[PDB]
């Protein structure tokens, strides 16, 4: 059925947009020292998984949740900082800059691929309506 392709590709587009948004947020806040609660900015990551509940193996993509990374927060020595711990260490984000740049580019590419899939399926469905004049 070509109609379900609309839902599949729309889900893919939304998920990749969310992934690119997460990557952009990580890139922007790579040097943030604090948040509103005084906690360091932890790198965010989306969780991709299929959505084929009505008895299928393939159904597209959906973002289950956004999770903060468990890699070690970078400790910088600064004793004058109000946020420094007992040893004088301040926690800083664990953002991987090269990783987030590659994530941005890859998300853009797969987003574009899904755009092309949607356009092709729309063209095919348009051509179908002229079956036998």
């Amino acid at each position: 059925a070509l109609l379900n392709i609309f839902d599949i590709a729309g889900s893919a587009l939304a998920a990749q947009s969310k992934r690119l948004n997460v990557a952009a947020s990580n890139l922007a806040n790579a040097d943030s020292v604090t948040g509103p609660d005084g906690q360091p900015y932890r790198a965010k990551q989306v969780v991709f998984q299929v959505d084929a509940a009505p008895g299928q193996a393939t159904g597209g993509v959906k973002v289950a949740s956004v999770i903060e990374s468990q890699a070690p927060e970078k400790l910088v020595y600064e004793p004058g900082n109000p946020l420094a711990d007992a040893n004088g260490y301040v926690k800083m984000p664990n953002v991987d800059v090269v990783g987030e740049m590659v994530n941005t580019m890859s998300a853009s590419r797969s987003y574009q691929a899904n755009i092309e899939v949607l356009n092709t399926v729309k063209s095919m469905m348009l051509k179908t309506l002229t079956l036998g004049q």
Partner: protein, 52 residues
């Protein structure tokens, strides 16, 4: 703060502090009963990314 522009900045600051100590020692040569200073440095916490 790419973790390599911070680590080298820390070293630059340490060398500048050592140079300040040396300049203070040299400027106070003619003073009476002056005890020379010596700068001591220690590396900070080592961060373990992945266990052996």
């Amino acid at each position: 703060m790419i973790s390599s522009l911070w680590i080298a900045k820390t070293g630059l600051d340490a060398q500048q502090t050592n140079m300040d100590v040396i300049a203070n020692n040299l400027a106070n040569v003619s003073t009476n009963g002056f005890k020379r200073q010596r700068a001591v440095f220690e590396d900070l916490l080592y961060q373990t990314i992945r266990q052996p």
